[PDB]
């Protein structure tokens, strides 16, 4: 029951925090305002625009009122402001985390493809509704503490509803799981799906160059009837048997000629089969496992051309690839019958093993658009590091604080500083979204520099 003195907020920390707050404020105001002007002048545009609105709203609602409450240590306004400021704050936070998830999913759907403004209204409606409990639980109370008479605006311990009484006690867990863990989980999930989708896209362009793509049944360089991307339909010399097997292969024959999308589906079947056969092979699985995503596709390319058995014959080269001896395996593969028979395909594949990149196949325009989206996902990394100090502070208050442990005043003193730091970090994220997007997108960088 005794105490140490939790007025805390050393007069020295008040200067540092309020200077950091002013820097983040104007830079966040300027940064998000000029971002909105670029969007309103020139799909992903509106999602970034909604994010900047949530950023701008979060800056103006969460920075000044906490700067005042730090220096003045008082709530001068009425009960409406006590119920309005937290309500607007949790609405802007919801808009921000939902815009990021809608933005990440948008990048996944943009790559997997081979009702946007509706989500905005859905985001803002859901963000407001989920923030409503803040406008009901907050209220103004007074007390005679120490030698003064204070007027406090807080989340009331007593509520007129069993649901609100639960929200008053478990608010920080609801914020930590929904406004932090859930976006991190959703984003990391669709980022993983996007990279796996970009990988099966590159292996398509890779094989399309080395094997070609034909929408009608054709005869191969060896002389066998083939369609799609090197999809063997039959090894029989009868052209009539090829048409019969082709119609039996698809299940819905358009007389023997297909489109681009049908061949892509056929191609993905063969890649899945090639991956399964490699994993079932005791010679190929250990080498395939040690390889990166790029060199995995180079091995799948060889399995596409020579089958699992033929690739397994490169005993010396496979061991070199497993031991990451790229140049030694390149020289060894060049001495093969495979290199002599198909030099163009072999030289590109060998180069891919040698350099570990897609440089021999993909064009630079596609290479640039991919690296933008993949790196632009760093907005969630900044989101995770900026909102962690504030969330960690509220978690520690629900974990370490015990009324019966008398040295707790030293703890509340520490939490006051961590709370005002976390409120600056969470606002710096709204301030860093234009800075990070400017430094990353390159296109946005030239649009930013066009101002001044």
């Amino acid at each position: 029951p005794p105490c140490q003195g939790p007025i805390e907020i050393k007069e020295t920390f008040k200067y540092i925090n309020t200077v950091v707050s002013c820097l983040v404020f104007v830079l966040g105001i300027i940064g998000n305002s000029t971002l909105l002007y670029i969007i309103y002048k020139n799909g992903p545009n509106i999602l970034i625009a909604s994010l900047a609105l949530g950023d701008l709203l979060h800056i103006v609602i969460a920075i000044p009122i906490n700067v005042y409450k730090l220096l003045a240590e008082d709530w001068p306004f009425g009960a409406e402001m006590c119920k309005l400021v937290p309500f607007i704050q949790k609405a802007s936070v919801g808009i921000t985390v939902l815009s990021l998830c809608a933005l990440s999913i948008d990048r996944y759907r943009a790559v997997a493809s081979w009702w946007t403004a509706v989500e905005i209204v859905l985001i803002w409606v859901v963000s407001v509704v989920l923030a409503v409990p803040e406008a009901i639980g907050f209220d103004i109370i007074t007390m005679d503490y120490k030698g003064s008479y204070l007027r406090i605006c807080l989340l009331h311990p007593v509520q007129k509803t069993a649901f609100m009484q639960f929200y008053a006690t478990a608010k920080d867990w609801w914020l930590f799981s929904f406004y932090f863990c859930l976006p991190l989980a959703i984003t990391a999930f669709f980022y993983t799906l996007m990279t796996c989708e970009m990988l099966r896209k590159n292996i398509f362009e890779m094989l399309r160059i080395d094997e070609g793509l034909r929408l009608k049944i054709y005869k191969d360089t060896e002389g066998y009837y083939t369609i799609g991307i090197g999809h063997l339909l039959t090894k029989s010399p009868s052209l009539n048997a090829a048409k019969s097997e082709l119609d039996k292969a698809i299940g819905r024959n358009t007389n023997g000629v297909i489109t681009k999308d049908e061949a892509e589906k056929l191609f993905n079947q063969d890649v899945d089969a090639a991956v399964r056969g490699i994993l079932r092979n005791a010679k190929l699985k250990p080498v395939y496992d040690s390889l990166d995503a790029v060199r995995r596709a180079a091995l799948i390319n060889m399995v596409f051309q020579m089958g699992e058995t033929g690739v397994a014959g490169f005993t010396n080269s496979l061991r070199m690839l497993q031991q990451k001896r790229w140049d030694e395996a390149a020289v060894n593969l060049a001495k093969s019958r495979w290199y002599n028979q198909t030099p163009n395909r072999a030289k590109r594949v060998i180069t891919t093993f040698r350099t570990g990149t897609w440089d021999a196949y993909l064009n630079d325009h596609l290479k640039q658009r991919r690296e933008v989206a993949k790196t632009v996902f760093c907005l969630v990394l900044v989101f995770a590091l900026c909102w962690l100090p504030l969330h960690l502070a509220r978690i520690l208050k629900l974990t370490l604080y015990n009324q019966n442990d008398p040295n707790r005043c030293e703890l509340l003193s520490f939490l006051l500083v961590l709370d005002y730091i976390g409120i600056n970090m969470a606002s710096l994220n709204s301030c860093a979204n234009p800075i990070a997007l400017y430094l990353v997108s390159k296109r946005f960088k030239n649009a930013f520099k066009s101002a001044l």
């Binding site: 939790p6 240590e73 704050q89 639980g137 007390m143 406090i152 807080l154 509220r394 509340l412």
Partner: peptide
């Protein structure tokens, strides 16, 4: 912030100085 009860004036003074979150 919030407190277990208004009888904990040390916690209520904490929310007096605490951020509005």
């Amino acid at each position: 912030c919030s407190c277990s009860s208004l009888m904990d004036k040390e916690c209520v003074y904490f929310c007096h100085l605490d951020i509005i979150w």
